[PDB]
Structure formats: structure tokens, C-alpha cells
């Protein structure tokens with residue numbers, strides 16, 4: 146009923162949308178992994194009379210439910226999707242998207258890692274993002290590669306019309322107590338990558354983490370703080 150949703154409102158298999166700004170929504174779903182349940186976020190950005198999707202809803206059935214929820218709540222077609230790194234919370238559901246008319250994109254690094262992991266593989270490669278600090282335009286967003294953080298391939302997304310910074314899994318929510326799933330992380334480079342984000346997007350008004358509640362720019366410093374303590 147208006148607050149940002151959590152698992153206690155999200156059974157696995159259901160998707161909720163949350164209006165972030167004009168023409169910007171997050172999507173929230175939940176999934177089981179290794180016997181625990183987690184929420185995860187993605188983004189939807191209005192692109193004229195179409196929609197750009199950032200990240201799947203963490204699995205095939207969640208992603209089908211996402212498309213249904215978008216049709217119910219927004220009613221514009223999703224034409225393109227970008228996955229911001231290679232893990233299942235970002236690409237699991239790409240096959241569903243591809244069979245629903247959506248053109249799927251990721252960096253070549255993400256595509257290679259997804260293929261090696263046995264995860265679903267976006268169709269199209271996003272060039273121009275291979276060096277930290279690189280940025281490219283993609284419809285109504287800017288894609289930015291900050292350097293290695295949660296993963297070596299993680300991308301962040303900026304919506305300039307609304308000053309919305311979608312950090313993906315390189316950014317944690319303010320309540321976080323540790324740096325999340327660090328299996329593929331670079332804890333030593335992560336603060337430097339976060340500093341790059343802070344320097345590039347100083348006018349961000351909303352910051353959305355890969356998992357958990359949006360807030361403001363403090364999410365970036367908080368992330369650096371929890372990661373430094375995790376490394377140590």
C-alpha cells in the first residue's frame with residue numbers, strides 16, 4: 146500500500162512495481178537460493194511509447210510474471226533489456242524475454258561470464274564499456290562501467306531525466322550488514338569503483354541498490370563502508 150515492498154509482501158513468483166519518478170519504476174521479486182529467500186530489484190524506464198528493462202526478475206517464472214505486471218500496470222511494450230552482470234538475478238529470465246519479443250543486451254564481459262557459469266546469455270554485446278569510467282547511451286539511460294566491485298563486469302545505470310542512479314549489485318541498501326554475495330567480488334577494488342560512481346553522478350537524487358530499499362547518495366558511502374569491513 147505504498148511503501149517499498151519487501152518479501153513479506155512478495156511471495157516467490159510474484160512481482161511488484163514501484164514508481165520511482167516520472168517514467169521510472171523499479172521491479173521487485175523474490176527468489177530462493179541455497180535455502181534462503183532474497184529480494185532483488187531491477188529497473189523499467191519509459192522510452193517514448195516503449196519500455197527499456199534493466200535486469201530480469203531472477204528466474205524464468207518471475208520474469209514471465211514481471212512482463213504480466215508491466216502489461217497490467219503500464220501497458221507499453223518492453224522492447225529492449227540490459228543485464229548489469231552475469232548472475233542469475235540479472236540474466237535468469239533472458240530466455241523468457243527473448244521469446245516475448247525483447248532484444249537482450251549485456252557487455253561482452255557479462256556474456257562470456259554468463260556462458261561460462263551456465264547462466265542465460267543476452268543476445269547482443271554492448272561495446273564501449275570495457276574500461277573503468279566508460280559510459281555509453283542506451284535509449285533513455287546512460288550505462289557506466291565503474292570497475293570491478295560486486296563482480297568484474299557490473300554496470301550501473303543512470304536515468305538523466307530523473308537523476309536516478311541504479312547501482313545494481315555494486316550498491317547495497319542502508320540496512321546492509323555485510324557486502325552480500327561476494328563469490329565473484331573484488332573487495333579491494335570495490336571502494337575505488339564506488340568512488341568512481343560518486344564522482345561521475347554527484348547529482349543523483351535516488352539511488353537504487355541491486356537488493357533492498359532505495360535511498361539517496363548515502364547508499365554509496367555505506368556500501369564502501371560495509372565492503373571495507375568485509376575485506377577486513
Ligand SMILES: C[C@@H](c1cccc2c(-c3ccc(CS(C)(=O)=O)c(F)c3)c(C(=O)O)[nH]c12)N1CC(CCCN)OC1=O
Nearest residue numbers: 178183232233234314317321322323324325326328355356
Ligand atoms: C544470484 C546471486 C545471489 C544469490 C543469493 C544472494 C545474493 C545476494 C545478497 C545476499 C545478501 C544480501 C543482504 S546483505 C547486503 O545485508 O548481506 C543481499 F542484499 C544480497 C547478492 C548480491 O549481494 O548481489 N547476490 C546473490 N549470486 C550467485 C552467486 C554465485 C556465483 C558463483 N560463481 O553470486 C551471486 O551474487
Ligand SMILES: [Zn+2]
Nearest residue numbers: 230232295314
Ligand atoms: Zn551478483
Ligand SMILES: [Zn+2]
Nearest residue numbers: 234314355356
Ligand atoms: Zn545481486
